[PDB]
Scaffold this active site. Sequence first.
Site, PDB file in Angstrom:
ATOM      1  N   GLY A 261       0.807  -1.202   0.000  1.00 19.72           N
ATOM      2  CA  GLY A 261       0.000   0.000   0.000  1.00 19.72           C
ATOM      3  C   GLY A 261       0.844   1.256   0.000  1.00 19.72           C
ATOM      4  O   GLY A 261       1.665   1.463  -0.898  1.00 19.72           O
ATOM      5  N   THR A 262       0.645   2.097   1.010  1.00 20.36           N
ATOM      6  CA  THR A 262       1.377   3.361   1.210  1.00 20.36           C
ATOM      7  C   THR A 262       1.172   4.222  -0.042  1.00 20.36           C
ATOM      8  O   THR A 262       0.059   4.264  -0.586  1.00 20.36           O
ATOM      9  CB  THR A 262       2.829   3.080   1.560  1.00 20.36           C
ATOM     10  OG1 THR A 262       3.469   2.397   0.474  1.00 20.36           O
ATOM     11  CG2 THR A 262       2.914   2.214   2.804  1.00 20.36           C
ATOM     12  N   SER A 263       2.206   4.906  -0.526  1.00 17.55           N
ATOM     13  CA  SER A 263       2.069   5.794  -1.672  1.00 17.55           C
ATOM     14  C   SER A 263       3.287   5.663  -2.572  1.00 17.55           C
ATOM     15  O   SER A 263       4.424   5.761  -2.101  1.00 17.55           O
ATOM     16  CB  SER A 263       1.898   7.250  -1.224  1.00 17.55           C
ATOM     17  OG  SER A 263       1.799   8.117  -2.341  1.00 17.55           O
TER      18      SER A 263
END
EC number: 3.4.25.1
Lengths: 233, 87, 205, 241, 243, 243, 242, 250, 244
Positions: C9-11
């Site tokens: 996930g995260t960015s």
Amino acid sequence: FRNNYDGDTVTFSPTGRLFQVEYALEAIKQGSVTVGLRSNTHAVLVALKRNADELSSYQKKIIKCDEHMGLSLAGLAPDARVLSNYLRQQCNYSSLVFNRKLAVERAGHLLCDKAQKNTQSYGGRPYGVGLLIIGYDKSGAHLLEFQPSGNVTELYGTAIGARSQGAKTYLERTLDTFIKIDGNPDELIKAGVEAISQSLRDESLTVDNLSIAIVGKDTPFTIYDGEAVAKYI
Amino acid sequence: LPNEAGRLEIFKIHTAKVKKTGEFDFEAAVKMSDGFNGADIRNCATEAGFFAIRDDRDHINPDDLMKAVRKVAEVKKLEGTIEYQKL
Amino acid sequence: LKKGEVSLGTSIMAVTFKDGVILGADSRTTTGAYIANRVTDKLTRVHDKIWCCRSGSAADTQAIADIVQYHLELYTSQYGTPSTETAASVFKELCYENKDNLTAGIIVAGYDDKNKGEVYTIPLGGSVHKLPYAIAGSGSTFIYGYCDKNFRENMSKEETVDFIKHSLSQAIKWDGSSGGVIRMVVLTAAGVERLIFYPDEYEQL
Amino acid sequence: GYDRALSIFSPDGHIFQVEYALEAVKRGTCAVGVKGKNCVVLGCERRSTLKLQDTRITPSKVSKIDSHVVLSFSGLNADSRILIEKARVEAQSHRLTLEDPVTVEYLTRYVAGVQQRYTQSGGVRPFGVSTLIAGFDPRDDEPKLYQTEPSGIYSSWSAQTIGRNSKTVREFLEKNYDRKEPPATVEECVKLTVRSLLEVVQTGAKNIEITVVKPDSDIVALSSEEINQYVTQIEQEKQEQ
Amino acid sequence: AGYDRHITIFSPEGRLYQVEYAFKATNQTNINSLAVRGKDCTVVISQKKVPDKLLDPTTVSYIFCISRTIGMVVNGPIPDARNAALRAKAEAAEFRYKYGYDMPCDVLAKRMANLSQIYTQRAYMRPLGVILTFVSVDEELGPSIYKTDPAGYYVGYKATATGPKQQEITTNLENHFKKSKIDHINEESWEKVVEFAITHMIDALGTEFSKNDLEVGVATKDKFFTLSAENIEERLVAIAEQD
Amino acid sequence: GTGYDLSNSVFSPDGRNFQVEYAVKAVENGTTSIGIKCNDGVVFAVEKLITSKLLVPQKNVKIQVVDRHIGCVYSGLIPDGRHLVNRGREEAASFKKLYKTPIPIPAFADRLGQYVQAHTLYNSVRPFGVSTIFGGVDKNGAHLYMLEPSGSYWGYKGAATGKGRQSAKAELEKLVDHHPEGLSAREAVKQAAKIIYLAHEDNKEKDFELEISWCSLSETNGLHKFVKGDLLQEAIDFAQKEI
Amino acid sequence: DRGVSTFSPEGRLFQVEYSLEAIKLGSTAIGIATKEGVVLGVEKRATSPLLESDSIEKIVEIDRHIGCAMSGLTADARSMIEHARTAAVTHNLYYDEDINVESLTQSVCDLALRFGEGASGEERLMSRPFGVALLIAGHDADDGYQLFHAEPSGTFYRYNAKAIGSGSEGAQAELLNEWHSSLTLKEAELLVLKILKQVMEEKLDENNAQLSCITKQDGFKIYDNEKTAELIKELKEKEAAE
Amino acid sequence: MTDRYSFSLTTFSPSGKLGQIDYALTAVKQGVTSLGIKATNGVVIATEKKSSSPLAMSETLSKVSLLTPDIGAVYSGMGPDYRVLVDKSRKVAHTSYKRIYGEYPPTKLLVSEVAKIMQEATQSGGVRPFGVSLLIAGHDEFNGFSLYQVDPSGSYFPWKATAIGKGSVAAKTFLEKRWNDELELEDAIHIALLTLKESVEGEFNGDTIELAIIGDENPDLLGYTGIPTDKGPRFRKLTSQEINDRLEAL
Amino acid sequence: GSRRYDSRTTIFSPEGRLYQVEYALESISHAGTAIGIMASDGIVLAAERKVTSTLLEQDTSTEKLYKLNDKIAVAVAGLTADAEILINTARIHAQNYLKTYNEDIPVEILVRRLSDIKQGYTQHGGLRPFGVSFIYAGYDDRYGYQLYTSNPSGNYTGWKAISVGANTSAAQTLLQMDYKDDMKVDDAIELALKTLSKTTDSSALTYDRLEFATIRKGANDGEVYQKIFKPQEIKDILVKTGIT
């Protein structure tokens, strides 16, 4: 002769030829004789049927594929039934999948792919029966000549069988005649009768011997047998 | 077999007494020669003369040379690579 | 997405500009209660001139990114220098048939002497498309407003870094699943340049 | 596996793998049998060259396929074990599929039908053994004796022999035995087989094995002392007459 | 029973007839090449022969690149040469994905040799009529050259060669190592190693080549590339100046 | 021994193959075909020998086009020539599926190369006795290749094989000296028709046919199509003017 | 010593040419197809007097209205009948009707030449083609009574009167002048036995010959030994006339 | 399709033997001769390195491979199929034992698996028998030190000491009087050197001779410490300098 | 093509036999001689190794003998390579009967399952038959002590005294006249020692070239004991019987 070099299907001759292809090619020249021709809007297929006895019947030399196309066989009869199954399968394949009728030009390429697999691999054999592919599409009438090697070439008309190559004399002098005849299916059928008559020696054309199948634009492929061809004799 | 450096002087030997044009290059036939020998170039100079007879040319053009040089490479069937006794 | 699987996930994002393209990602890996690995790296090199990030499930991308290296090795040696359109197509076919078993986000970008930089992002569906800037992951959900407003076409090297540095900073403070050090890669005509930040730097801006 | 064909038509129209396989039967032990009204007797010999062979531990030359029908072959013993095992499995498979006891007619056409496959199957060779199937159908007292040839052709015979010296025994069974008036007793059927074995076994005892087939799933194998009992009675009426 | 010589089987002399003819197929093209081990790298050279002017010099090459860290040079007919070329590239890719990091030189020569041993033992496959020669720089043993024979026997060489004149070329590389008592060239720069092997090739063959008459491969550490026409011609300039 | 020329995998005592050599003779028994390579693209031309008047004019297409960027012309057995394109058609479809953008010219040569190599490695199949000439416009520049029955191929500035191989291809050497800097795609069409008539001296005993197809980025822009309209008839009068 | 697909210089397969010669090596099967029915007959050719009349059956039953006879080697005949009954009885399940006699002949004859070694494209396992000749007879509601001949070469013709086996030459030419379109069922029975009596070694009886019949109502029926003996006694009166 | 040869290349000769395995043993004598000697303290095997080219490297060429850490192997000749047999032997040894029984197989069971691969080549079609002859020597907890001779025909026989190769006739006879019941490991090395030296017509040094010995369990060759159970592998490969130390020792 | 290189392993000869099987029977005469003996209280097996010398290992080895079961032994005479294939499949098929029916396998069932393997290559597969012969001896409560032998052709018959290998007809001559039904285990050993001594090619007879594995029955009835004679016990019976 017999088996020296090319008796094995994967062997090439020192002269750059293949005897196995030549062996199956000679099977057509010694088989039943048949002729054919075509016009812009029509195509005529005439075949002669023989047998080994007077009391015996005559096996049909014309196999129907679909309503818009047909063919004829000169050679071993059961070998043409296997090739006819592959051609009729492609007719229903393009009808179910592509909702289109199989074109004559594309039918020759698909038929060539079946024979080339047996010639290039051991354990198989090329079909020693010839196939004259007739049909009609939006482009026009087309005629093809099949060989045991699988060569496909579009022609106005040709003949394969016993003394069939000598019967092409009438087709060459009349080559400029039937190609310009449109809308006259009766004259185009009678043109093929005089062409096959040049190869007749022992027996002539009779009711049961003559088999004519015509295909065209407004007229689908129909096999005329029995007394249907008695008026065109 | 004479190599590319050995054959370079051989082309001028067979063509020494053969009349030709003023512009000539023998370096073209060096690469065109595949496994040839010193005598086979005389064949290349011989076939080049008959090619100019049909065109009515007393001097052999460089274009007729390359046709005769490959003519030996077209024929072949002489083997020549089967000799292992070189020591 | 099953229960108990590691998801990145995260960015992750990339911005093309005149002199090349510069990518970026954070170091944090978090599934739902806990930050598993904060020192890791989501950047994957399938080729010297072609880089690929990883988003979604961790093992789903790590397995696909390695298969592409197997295909590009046969693609580069047998043919030649790969391009951006060809490399992105390999990720598509792997995610199309495995879509049921393997579902993850993928962003592919590379450098070329003709078309310069290009960004190709693959959502969970498996399709691939061309965009000047593309974001993916759970952290990038909050940066859609900032990235679209301040984006400019054909920027400089200093403006490209400041655009990504400020964009990823909003994906961290506003989303706990993303954070850590910011890992970025620079693609120019000279070569590959590595750039890394620290939480004590961008948080003060 | 092995896809190459073996049986090939000879230019005369025959097959080499067939005719050359029939010579293995003529070089084997002769198997002769007859059938009466209420009984069927199948005789078989053994190899007289080899000695020190215990009869108990040695497998019987007459294989029992079913309670009411047995099989006595002559030919290659390597190809016979394949036919015996596959005929007994089908005997139980027929009882499983149709819930019916097998019949002598169905058993013969099956064994002969299986032999037709190997002749027509590329990669295998025909059997070099000929089997003789004799028994009684369920709820039927009619004798059934069928010959199974290695070529696949099967037929019924009143008295028939196979193996070495077959033509000598066949000429003896035509004049001495009559198909119109078969013997209705078991003792006359046993003595008839012994008379056919005097011209082949040539004064031997332990090399003779006679199997008696009776209806209602009754099989009585004659021991060594019981076979020699019928031999003595025939020899006394042979030289004296 | 004259078919005993047409396939691979034990001969009454205890040898293999089809294997003896596999080495003879490499001399059909008559292409001489050699490879030497430098100090920190390995440089391989080959004779570039273009029979017809219609051939593109950039397309015709006897040196193929298996991977970025490994070069390859093959002698003999091109169809059997490029047959094992694509097979070697597949083994280098399977080793990166499944096994681990990039493949070294010895593993590639061993796997391709074992692949030919299976084709040699099995009678339905003919052996390759070429010779596989791999050059690269390992991160452990340094520069190494492994020449794979068509019989499936691989062995390491210090300075190898190929072609029908190999026996005359080997004498040149052998006599140089006997006087200096060194197993590799002590020159650190790879530029001097290129001109080193070219000097011994010209004096052995007695022929001065050109920019299009030679193809010089250069295998450095974790990098491999092929010299272009301007790079090969530049090496021939300093050779005529020094000697 | 005896029978080295019977099967395929059996090597000759000198390290060659007879079946490969016998397949070369089958190439010279078919209709000849030529080719011309330029900077913008390549030009294909083939002379189809007409047997009798029963042939229908210009309804037969011998050149089988692979996608839009690759034409294929062959000289040899017709059945063996169509199987190579049908195999390459599936390779081009399998490439564009995974690899997106179409396959370039030097890449497509490897698919037909290895596929012919497998036929020479088996005794159950025979090699292709047809020589196929293929090419087109790739992503960078252009390339042209000629597949030989042995599987050997390279980059060709021109390729011709057939009954007129000794004639038509010999005239390609004059084309290099005529335009050493470069040749336009439009002029190459008229030059291709002249080469057919220069090698027609052996074909004068029968009837011929002219079929020319070219592809480049100047006009068609990556489209391989046959020449029709007044452009084909214009090249006939220019070629027959010097005859 | 070659492959089964090798062609002879005449343009034929060696397996096909030598299979036709095996027909004369066996018994003789003679049959005649008329408008009122088809009279078929065979010859058992007993080599020993101890052979039972129920042993060799050369006339089987594919359908109630369809029947056939065999000649030559009967090893290949039993396999074809299993496939003939398969292509017939199962065809009844598909279309809920009786299969055509000509259509059934095509399905049986197509299984002859499918042999080979390592056939590409599908799985076909056969060592040799069938060396048996079958005469296919039957009756339908359209064309009527028809008698075909299944050759090992994969071809079939419709014969009104056909004699195969050892009588394919001498006994075949005798049926040309003895056949007529008005031939009834009763007169055809005495005509077949008239030919079978002259071509047989010993006298004609029920043990050495077995005849069958195919009609529209009764369908396939085999003549009893008592029924056959009555036709033989009537044949002796026809032999001696003037 | 693939291959159309399903038949075995090995057929029974009219003389009552197999023509393939008869000529296979002849090919073993066409190449370099190996040997080995079994003693009470270990097994000592030796061979010779014949370089086809004077510029070849003998370090990259290893004629003595390792199947299991406690068992070595040595062949004769060039060993074209030796690499195929060892690659297939290391797989079947670990799969059938290490991956099932958890431990390496003993010497008697390993030679049965090595011969199990070679015996299939003489029967299963499409392949030819192996023309190499190996030697299986190792140590276990029951049979102890044992050396087995692997014949190219697929049969194995135990032997105290044997030498197979071009000099197999003279070398095997010389080992009869040089062997007895009580021998050491280092004492058996001098036996191998005196016999091999007479068979070497070329250069005699330590680089052209590969001497492999099986001693006790060496902790230095193990690679980890702290486990008293595993003391390290018994098989050890002597370096080039250690072999030359015993050459002048004669 | 593959038809030319094929030697046609299994084909019917004009004489009615098989070529490869006829030549495989000769290979038995070129191998060691194995002679089984069935006594009243047990079964005595004898064998002789071929190509033996001083360098051979006499400590633990059996070339011509193996153990397929606790109650069943086997005597191997023929090619050793083709023997291990049938021996490995023997213990597999023997344990499958013990794994399912949970009882000791008899000899009659064990041999017929192994014979079908040899009968398979002689029919299909296009391969060569096994050129090794076996002699199966075991104990059973059905027929009692059973002694059987096999052949490359795949046939098995009952034998009281069987001799295979070199000098087959020479050994069977002395075994026929000296055989008795009351012969015990001790008297059966003397029959094999005198036979192997006169039929060999050497002068004297040592204990290194011979192998003996018998089947003894202890005090408890119903279960026998398989005992393979060690070289220490082989040299002991040579002195007691006077063979030396």
